[PDB]
């Protein structure tokens, strides 16, 4: 079926649902974060303060805060209700390309072009750790659902796993011949998925071995997201499509067409009924 | 960030640095027998304090910013009027090189660490003689008051850090673990932790319990200076490996490596606002970074 | 409540209370600074040495020193008890129109018609920084209560925020239809007020956003001051009045009438029960 | 009569300069709102508003042909308006402008303590008048064009030989700032308006003819009658006073009250007077 | 037992001194980073050798008198014509030419004694076994053995031909700071933070411990005849002892200063002391 559309003046490169499902946050190239009421499709208050493109957004698990990463090299925290900048994190030397909120709510992770992943302490507003190892841009970061581990995806063709507590690297998953552009954990923590150029890979987390490769995209896969029950996987690509795959059977489920430009971010509704995609065509689409 | 805003050029060994309490001035101790005071904003050289006969190994501002103290290989500690309008006293009594000095938070006393194995607590306002603390058969390289002024810590060649109660001159605890000479020490603003710089390593201690909390590894040669950030988040180290490092206290991670220097880094110091740190090196430069 | 009145032989353009509350300094067109014992109403000393109008005055936080700015292009430091000139600062090329003493007591700020804001190190007597950003005259300077920041108000329609230590500009607030003629921080440090033509504007410091505009004045607002508890705002204007505003309610509190000429400066007693104004009518008035 | 005729409005700030056109039919108002207004003396029309200045306009003057107007502003420019302006500059704020009777020259009084003299056609600065130790608040050419007179905050009235840039006389007597100046149509006398009170000076002898007392506050404005018989004073006391130039006695007092009178100008036939006041009113009286 | 001249120019601690083999020239290594050479007969300043970047802790002449070696904190050993360089990973604190003149031994802060062939410039022998900085080295007069003093509190004897440790002399409570080999090769001297010890080479036992100094003993030198031993201390005395007896022979008062280094004239007529002030002194 056909989605709904929301419109931004500029490229929408990041999207996320509030934990309750009632709000939708959109990160854009107008240097703002837009917040929509999902039911009415009305645009609530905007979040301004970033000085460059907003590349990623994520809600706190309690839904009270929103974290954002930007090309201005900063990570900001926003009070959702008040639509206010609550904090600003500095340290990254280059564009911040991804962020993730810990399931705990106490930490934000960021990935940047400076070749590091950083962890920020939400309560104190300080840097908890800098994660060093990658030799190229870090395009994606994601927390393990138990909150103990963070995974980082880099252009150096590696996926690195670190202990959140100590900042220590635990594993390196090799993905050769490729730039890892996106990462996501399954909600059960058993699987990890990464987006590459035209391809989506599945990994068994306990083993660090590759389970399967999903073929069908014809361009860079910049966004991946697991459904809340882990059964479905969504991918966003430069080929303009969004693809759904059946995780257990490891086949194509369906292809979502409609975007006229690259899809930079994909996010499931917490109930699993809806998917949101953001595209360079300046639209956010909600698909059931 | 770790980027550097400015560079100062001195042309000799810059072995000690400290910021004024307001943040606007910088004192530099040099291999010349001189102390320099710089304006941080303009980078202008305000004044040069002469009198020492040998290397100046440590410098400190009084908490009220009116006085500078300097410790030297000539075996003296000198007190300078910052305005420069007035010469001041000199502290004599140490039999060997003085490698460290620290002001008590009230500005009434100064502590000094010498190679003679003694830590001396001198009176600033008063002209009387001072208390002697004895270091354990080995030279004392480093000294620091706790922020509350109740504790003084000393770093020695015995590979231990010593804590005294300032009021009674009583030795409260002994911190052991370093495999070598402890060259620097710094209290957390909380007063809860202590930071140790030694031969290759940076240690974190729980002051109350006298236990080691962590060891920071990453320097490849002797760590000559340490500094605790005002927020307590970060730690700064200077080393003979020619780098300076910033460490995340919680995780013990290399928040940043500052790679401008070509020669050993003898001293590091945080700005009072915690935004920038200054590093001093044998390459005859002072580098300021955020 | 009718105030009490002191006189100067010429225009009184500046006033400030000692931190203890017992003294009142008045800057005038006599080229002198007058000091009054508030309780007795007696004139304790005359500070002489300026060569032109004295435009602004400020006490050191310990009350031992007074700073003054003048049309002679100089900033002077006075020993109050001794009534002696202690230092003279030179460097500004044009009239100095405002001065401020930091809470730290280590730095004096000045704003001049030469388009620059200067910071002077009181202990050493040196020029610490020249702040250059503005493209027109600087009419006001104020320190943040934490002493980390200094703000400058200019004819170029900008308010600028600088780091005191490094002299680096941090922010530029835009107020474009307006010449910024006066500034004050709230004692909290959370808000800033600026005075323009007919209006007093309130800013949120952290967000740099405009909170309110206080309307009622019918001419230039040359002086603004927060009450020590932050609850009240005072404005001095060319319309000859002083207005008090309730900060939280954003409403008019009262209008102080009596002055027969423009009110150039206002200052609160540290207890908050009394206010002093200075006027071109050659009077300083103390109002409860 | 002293009847108040049209009250002229639209300026939104202090009106600090007024002048009649030489032909009598137009009225120019300079204000603190940074503009110059031109009015039809008959009321029937509103004419133009001259915009460009960035700061207070303190003086206006018409060229003797009535085709050009000059203005002085705090923005430090002297602008000649075609009635786009042409511009002239001052190191400091410019407070007074006067055209020579000839119309060949514009004199500008400034905060830099000097009077500038420009050749209108060329635009070339010809002479700088140096001598005052403070702001120059008012300037006027003698009817023969050979002399300029100036009032300053230094409390003096000065006479200059224009061609030679040379100071010829310094008239002293005011205790305070001289705020306005006027030259007599016969050129024999000069009028001072000050922070104390109005004075008359003999041009040839460089002596005081008289002191006019009556005002109870600052005198900001003075203007001679076209026949030279009378003098008008404007004050902070809110009266306009008329004095006999010969006898030196007060003739009449006009109570145009509630407002300080900042500028006054007589009509060319002498029947009318214009006053400027605060807050942007221009008043016309016979 | 007097003393004649005092020698000047060094701006810092003079921590090494050596006479040329044949007469006549004197070398001073200092904290000011340079090596001074002095003409002994005239008491003049012949030359200053510059290049080192850090403190110079040892100097030694080649047996032909044509080359001088220096050890510095800059981690170089340099050979000077009377320059060539060698490296160490750490600070070099001491050097000694073999009596043959074919080898330079260098003791470093890397816990090893380094041995180079001078003519080829190639390092061949590394002596390992010390657990801390090596502060002093000296060849046996036959060149078959090297002795080393370390901060580990030991004196070691090594067989030169095979980089193997032959003996470990223990006893000193603290850092050994200097060592010397007697001309007959029978006795070895240790200078430490408290005392000076004599080690019997054939027996591998301690002949005796010298207890007169009241502070650290920084230097030891054997007389050319082997009869007498000089000790230099922080207490500002130089002490002469009978090697056989081990009894104190004399005390030289310098006083104001701590003696950092001592050396005998090759004829045995003169003794040179180096001090912190940046003075060199000769006594008979």
Residue numbers in the entry:
A (entry chain E), C (entry chain B): 451 to 738
B (entry chain C): 449 to 738
D (entry chain A): 448 to 530, 536 to 738
E (entry chain D): 449 to 530, 537 to 738
Task: Recite the paper's sentences.
The tPkwA was the first prokaryotic WD40 protein isolated from the Thermomonospora curvata, which is a thermophilic actinomycete isolated from composted stable manure. In this work, we expressed and purified the WD40 domain of tPkwA (referred as tPkwA-C), and performed a systematic study on its stability, thermodynamics and folding kinetics. In summary, our current studies showed that tPkwA-C, a prokaryotic protein is a WD40 domain with reversible unfolding property and thermo-stability.
The three-dimensional structure of tPkwA-C was determined by molecular replacement with the model from our WDSP server and was refined to a resolution of 2.6 Å. The solved structure in P1 space group has five molecules in one asymmetric unit. Each molecule of tPkwA-C in the ASU folds into a seven-bladed β propeller with amino acid residues 449–738. The blades 1–7 were arranged around a pseudo seven-fold axis in sequential order and generated a water accessible channel in the middle of the propeller. Structure alignment of the five molecules showed that Chain B had the most significant conformational change from the other ones, and the most variable regions are among strand Ds and loops on top and bottom surfaces, which are supposed to be the interfaces for interacting with other proteins. More specific structural features contributing to stability are further revealed by crystal structure of tPkwA-C. The hydrophobic cores in the lower part of tPkwA-C surrounding the Phe 467 and Trp 485 seemed to be major factors stabilizing the structure. Unlike other Tryptophans of WD doublets, Trp486 and Trp 653 do not form any hydrogen bond with other amino acid residues. Compared to the Trp486 in chain C, the Trp486 of chain B flipped its indole ring, with quite significant conformational change of the surrounding residues.
